[PDB]
């Protein structure tokens, strides 16, 4: 009943199957290399990982 | 608040007091008897009874309805 | 006369299902009866054809000014 009403829409694909690992949002994700996080949290936490500006 | 659509309530449990009287019966001696059948499933207990409707019945954890 | 079945302009017709290669009057009459079939059956594509707009479902907010004034 309610337990199968809660699980009706599969999450095997689409934008809803992933979100940002910090701010928990579903816009502007980075799926490269397993970051799985949005571009502006990436800008906030870029240089601590090692993403340093040379180019 | 009071909208255009009227409010409809859920399945309210009526206070059916002294339902234990419907579990068993007392004869002249100390022997016991029942008016409800026994579910033989392993998921059902040995003391768990089964419902009483006009045509069929209904189990507890089993939810099997034996129909002819 | 050794022509493949997929090399035709009309395959699996609605009336007989045979593989027919229509001609100019034939294609004109078949398009006319198909348009009147959708108009009689009252589908979305028939309504778009009766109104005289696009049937393939694309944007026409900005384009399509050549239909009328």
């Amino acid at each position: 009943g309610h337990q199968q009403l809660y699980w009706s829409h599969p999450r095997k694909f689409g934008q809803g199957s992933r979100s940002c690992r910090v701010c928990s949002n579903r816009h502007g994700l980075i799926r490269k290399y397993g970051l799985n996080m949005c571009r502006q949290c990436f800008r906030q936490y870029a240089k601590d990982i090692g993403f340093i500006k040379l180019d | 608040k009071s909208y255009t659509t009227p409010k409809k309530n859920k399945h309210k449990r009526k206070k059916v007091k002294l339902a234990v009287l419907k579990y068993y019966k007392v004869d002249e001696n100390g022997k016991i008897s029942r008016l409800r059948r026994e579910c033989p499933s392993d998921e059902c207990g040995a003391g768990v009874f089964m419902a009483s409707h006009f045509d069929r019945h209904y189990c507890g954890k089993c939810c099997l309805t034996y129909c002819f | 006369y050794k022509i493949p079945d997929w090399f035709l302009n009309r395959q699996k017709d609605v009336k007989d299902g045979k593989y027919s290669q229509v001609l100019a009057n034939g294609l004109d009459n078949k398009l006319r009866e198909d348009l009147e079939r959708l108009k009689k059956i009252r589908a979305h594509r028939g309504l778009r054809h009766f109104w005289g707009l696009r049937v393939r479902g694309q944007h026409t907010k900005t384009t399509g000014r050549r239909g009328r004034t």
Partner: protein, 120 residues
């Protein structure tokens, strides 16, 4: 009065005829619709719908059932009934012609009304 024929087969021998050759007789879209396993993992709505269409009233006007699903493939077993269909706000009470076969139920349910332009 004309004996109408759909894809070269008449109504009786498309009515009593089996599902896999029906899928063969259909087009490419309906072939993939019916050839992707059992319609039970997600199409229980369609299952209950065509069984509620399968139960039949006596000889009068047919019963009305309402659908919230516009992606129905028309079958020979459910043709000739009276079905209302949801478009988003109201229900479009429409009749099933014998020539519905091969289409979708959403095509015959118009959603947006035609527009009219006055003074911008």
């Amino acid at each position: 009065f004309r004996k109408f024929t759909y894809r070269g087969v008449d109504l009786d021998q498309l009515l009593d005829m089996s599902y896999e050759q029906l899928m063969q007789l259909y087009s490419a879209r309906q072939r993939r619709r019916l050839s992707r396993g059992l319609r039970r993992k997600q199409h229980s709505l369609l299952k209950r719908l065509r069984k509620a269409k399968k139960e039949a009233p006596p000889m009068e006007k047919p019963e009305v059932v309402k659908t919230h699903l516009r992606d129905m493939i028309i079958l020979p077993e459910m043709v000739g009934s009276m079905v209302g269909v949801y478009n988003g706000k109201t229900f479009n009470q429409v009749e099933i012609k014998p020539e519905m076969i091969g289409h979708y139920l959403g095509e015959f349910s118009i959603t947006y009304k035609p527009v009219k332009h006055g003074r911008p």
